[PDB]
């Protein structure tokens, strides 16, 4: 029909009642430009659409509507790596075209087949603090919690690039037997960021390794929400049909959450805690549910979402929600970054509750998990002692505390300090970790089972 009105990202159509929910419609501007949207609400003889593309210039009887008569599905192909796409279901970059062999829905249940069997295969990042203290699995979800003084993009790229070199070393070990694929999606970040990422992937290896979805900040909030959904379709097909392990790097996850926030402000929808939607739980879930092993059980989708915290607080709604849902927490610290530690990952609150699922034992040691717990415990004591060193001085602290202050310093500067291309095998990391444990005496290492301490020291 024709546009009735427009109030923000919501468009009021006066139409007829034949449309179905999320059925595509195309808005024909008087310029003769077509932009796409999907109906968010349908009522009798009228619709509310949210348009992906644009949010202004929308007329009345000079404008027209046309129905596509297909509710939105993403055209998925398995020849997607190396190929350049834009976050809009097609490239607007003029990159190699998407093609379709299935079109798969982004609602969060197309044909979805996931974990009835939990991850047991270890996948390494080449970084000790990640791998040893928390571990990463063939379905693991780990949030990178970052800040406005940390460089989020440099760490994001760091984890991805080094996990591509380690992952074939692990294929030979028989941790794997199937392909590796990267799906990189950037949604609504700066130009400066976008360019940087592509440059990073090229240096380490190639861009044949990865598939790229690029979405620009100048493009709307409505576009931004569809951008990860496009990533999900890509990854699920690859795992399902061609038994490939898929690694998704989703940047920026915070970018996506602010978008949700905008479609409740310029909607009449009342928001929940701290101005973030009440139905914010469901929006976030959609990304995280579509993870784990994929049917055949040689395919998988593994997630590393990248969150930048704006206030850097742990009372902000985004970091909290994400944490309950995700299988691990990786906290990256501004204070380490300042001191000259790269990567500057603080493990004080990094925790996995699904620690068993995260570790490996058939392509990693059984001792891996036992040592990690002890290390974490001994790091924590070393932090309690650090605060006490400032207050009390060395004028009353105990013999035991002194060992813990030394351990803390040796631990930051050796374990967490690694070259920009220097990759550590998980077995070598144990040897490093054992050096860290070795200064404490056999009565301070009392919590650990006697069997392990007498065996390996």
């Amino acid at each position: 029909n024709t546009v009735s009105g427009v109030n923000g990202p919501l468009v009021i159509l006066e139409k007829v009642k034949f449309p179905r929910y999320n059925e595509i419609v195309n808005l024909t501007l008087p310029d003769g430009t077509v932009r796409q949207g999907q109906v968010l609400e349908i009522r009798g003889d009228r619709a509310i659409v949210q348009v992906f593309e644009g949010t202004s210039g929308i007329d009345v009887k000079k404008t027209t509507v046309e129905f596509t008569g297909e509710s939105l599905r993403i055209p998925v192909s398995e020849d997607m790596l190396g190929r350049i796409f834009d976050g809009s279901g097609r490239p607007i970059d003029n990159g190699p075209k998407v093609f379709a062999e299935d079109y798969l829905d982004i609602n969060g249940s197309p044909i979805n087949p996931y974990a009835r069997i939990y991850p047991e295969e270890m996948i390494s990042t080449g970084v000790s603090a990640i791998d040893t203290m928390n571990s990463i699995a063939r379905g693991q979800k780990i949030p990178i919690f970052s800040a406005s003084g940390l460089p989020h993009n440099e760490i994001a790229a760091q984890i991805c690039r080094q996990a591509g070199l380690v992952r074939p070393t692990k294929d030979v070990h028989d941790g794997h037997e199937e392909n590796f694929s990267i799906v990189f999606a950037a949604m609504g970040v700066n130009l400066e960021t976008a360019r940087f990422f592509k440059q990073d992937f090229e240096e380490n290896g190639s861009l044949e390794r990865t598939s790229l979805f690029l979405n620009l900040a100048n493009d709307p909030t409505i576009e931004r929400i569809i951008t990860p959904r496009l990533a999900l379709t890509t990854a699920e097909y690859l795992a399902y049909q061609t038994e490939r392990h898929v690694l998704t790097i989703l940047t920026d996850m915070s970018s996506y959450a602010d978008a949700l926030r905008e479609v409740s402000a310029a909607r009449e929808e009342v928001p929940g805690r701290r101005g973030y939607p009440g139905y914010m739980y469901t929006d976030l879930s959609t990304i995280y549910e579509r993870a784990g092993r994929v049917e055949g059980r040689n395919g998988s989708i593994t997630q590393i979402p990248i969150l930048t915290m704006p206030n850097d607080d742990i009372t902000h709604p985004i970091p909290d929600l994400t944490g309950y849902i995700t299988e691990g927490q990786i906290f990256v610290d501004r204070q380490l970054h300042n001191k000259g530690i790269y990567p500057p990952i603080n493990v004080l609150p990094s925790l996995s509750r699904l620690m068993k699922s995260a570790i490996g034992e058939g392509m990693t040691r059984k001792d891996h998990g036992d040592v990690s717990n002890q290390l974490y415990a001994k790091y924590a004591i070393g932090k309690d002692a650090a605060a006490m060193k400032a207050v009390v001085g060395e004028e009353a602290l105990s013999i035991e505390d002194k060992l813990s202050l030394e351990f803390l310093e040796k631990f930051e500067k050796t374990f967490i300090t690694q070259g920009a291309y220097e990759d550590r095998t998980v077995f070598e990391s144990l040897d490093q970790a054992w050096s860290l444990l070795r200064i404490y005496p056999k009565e301070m290492l009392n919590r650990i089972s006697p069997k392990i301490l007498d065996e390996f020291y």
């Binding site: 009449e268 009342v270 928001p271 805690r273 400032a390 009390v392």
Partner: protein, 51 residues
């Protein structure tokens, strides 16, 4: 007197550290977190009345 001064300085060095490192960020975190929750109750009400 000199032995007496040495004993007192140690209590005094301890306090100067103690205030800065513990007390001041404990006050900051409590005040700001309660401020933020308190304003939220008030704002949502306005939105519900309006709706």
């Amino acid at each position: 007197a000199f032995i007496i001064l040495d004993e007192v300085i140690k209590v005094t060095n301890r306090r100067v550290n103690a205030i800065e490192h513990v007390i001041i960020p404990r006050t900051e975190n409590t005040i700001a977190y309660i401020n933020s929750e308190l304003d939220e109750l008030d704002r949502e009400e306005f939105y519900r009345l309006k709706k």
